[PDB]
Amino acid sequence: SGLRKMAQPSGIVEPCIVRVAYGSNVLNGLWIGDEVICPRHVIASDTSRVINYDNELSSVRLHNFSIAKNNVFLGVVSAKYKGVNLVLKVNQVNPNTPEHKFKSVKPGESFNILACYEGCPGSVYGVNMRSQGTIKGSFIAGTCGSVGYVLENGILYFVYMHHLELGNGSHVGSNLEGEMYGGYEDQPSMQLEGTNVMSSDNVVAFLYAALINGERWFVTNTSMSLESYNAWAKTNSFTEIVSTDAFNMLAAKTGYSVEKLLECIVRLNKGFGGRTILSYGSLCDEFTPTEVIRQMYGVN
Amino acid sequence: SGLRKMAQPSGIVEPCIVRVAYGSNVLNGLWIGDEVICPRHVIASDTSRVINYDNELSSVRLHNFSIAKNNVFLGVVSAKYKGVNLVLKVNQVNPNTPEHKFKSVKPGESFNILACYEGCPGSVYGVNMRSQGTIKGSFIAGTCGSVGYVLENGILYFVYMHHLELGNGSHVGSNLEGEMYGGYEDQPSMQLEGTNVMSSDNVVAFLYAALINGERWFVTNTSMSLESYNAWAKTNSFTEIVSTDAFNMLAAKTGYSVEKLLECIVRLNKGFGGRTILSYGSLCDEFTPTEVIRQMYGVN
């Protein structure tokens, strides 16, 4: 039993991480095939002030890139912006390139961060995309270009590359096509995150995990209809539930309907009264139904 | 900024994981050199009742072990108990054996779990050893033999192998020498965990992490001497602080003395008053000083 936020194993991704430096900027790149993908601000003269990315590309020189993995030094033969990323053609193919695909994650979806520090994989942890396109991680100077990935059905997808932190501490990155999640600019200027909308699907999964774990104190002899919950969610910064299909197995195994748990959300959002659920002191929307089923039942 | 419980990358460990089955029992083994190490209960006829491990070894047959990694099947040529583990000599050397050492972790120390499901590495997360020798993870049937490890100064240490869950949900395992942490028996019978003693060193590190993060609401114009704190800790299920050396850098960078944070512990242990620190609702002892310095400053 137990519920922990996990990451999928990082081995397949680690050999793709390189150090990319330009001038005094140092970050990470993703070396796949004969390309290195990294955040384009590595070439900016001064990342502490608003950047004119036209001017930075105008004055770039390919020779000034310093890209390395251990004792392998990679020369840049072509450089393009692709959205907020640089795509750098290099003079060597990564012999450890894994089979892979690219996709974008959506709000409420979980994925893995390989946190890399000036070219060195340092740690791995799980995240969940928030409604405004942000994650709550732990990133510092030297960790841009850290890679997010997810394995599905034996297929490796690259889904995230790290770019910046907002003034409220939320973390912002892009897909590997260089589209920033949430639409944020790759600038140091103040950008607001709007209101965080909790993932109702994930809160339902969390309450199911507690029930699987034998923790049932919060369930009452009450239950809320789906339309009723959705009308409440729309004014309480929770998402509307569009389908209950993701909960069929959880409901069958625990014996608790989704609607009982919807009533629990509305009641518990007012506060836990000093109690905890799975050691949390308030509702948690970081776990998907899939994540809960996998770690608590060991299936799909 | 931010603080997350992380794991060190798992790639070096993943190629060492094998499926070990005997009869109807299925768990994981650690294949290093020409040895596979696994929990000895894989050979027990009925793990739901007290096991006479003499009787199970008496009736073992080497041919009945089924050990595999992908399309590699390993034959057992010798079997010994070493404490609560089996050490199995096999007929092939693991060509992906990493350089490694063995050591034991101590209460308050962090390490990484590679959670493995019937021979397949599934996920990786960080843990911290509790005073009674337990961890709070997420383990289910099929995950025994999952491996705990820590990288220090480029050296890989294997430190934990998973065996059982106590009635209160705490997780129990052994070192790779087969000594069970906490002294628990590898039996399904009720075993109590005594009182959990919080790691004061780690709580101090957690409060420093909050201060590094710019969260300072909980500090007051008060400070508690070291002997005074230790007398309080001894009757409040916290460890005594033996040395402040681990906090020199944290204190220098934040400007806050250890003694200010000791006063914070005594005050906050009575409750956070509905507030949070780094999103937690009560004090957290899962992070070491080293962990905080590494992820928040990127040093050693």
Residue numbers in the entry:
A (entry chain A), B (entry chain A): 1 to 300
What did the original publication write about this model?
Coronaviral Mpro is a 3C-like cysteine protease that cleaves the viral polyproteins (pp1a and pp1ab) at evolutionarily conserved sites to release non-structural proteins which are essential for viral replication and transcription in host cells. Our structural findings reveal that the active site of UU23 Mpro maintained conserved catalytic residues in addition to distinct, lineage-specific structural plasticity, especially in the loops forming the substrate binding subsites.
The flexible leucine-like P2 group was restricted into the S2 subsite mainly through hydrophobic interactions with L164. Notably, in this complex, two water molecules coordinated interactions between GC376 and T47, further stabilizing binding of the P2 group in the S2 subsite. These water molecules are missing in the SARS-CoV-2 (beta-CoV) structure where the P2 moiety has a slightly altered orientation and the S2 subsite is more hydrophobic and smaller, mainly due to the larger M49 and Q189. The P3 benzyl moiety was bound in the UU23 Mpro active site in a conformation similar to that in SARS-CoV-2, with conserved hydrogen bonding of the backbone with E165. The overall conserved binding mode across these variants is in agreement with the overall broad-spectrum activity of GC376 against coronaviruses. Our results confirm the lower nanomolar potency of GC376 (IC50 ~12.4 ±  1.3 nM) against the FECV variant, reaffirming its established efficacy against FIPV (IC50 ~130  ±  20 nM) and SARS-CoV-2 (IC50 ~26.4  ±  1.1 nM, 190  ±  20 nM) as well as broad-spectrum inhibition of 3C and 3C-like proteases including Mpro.
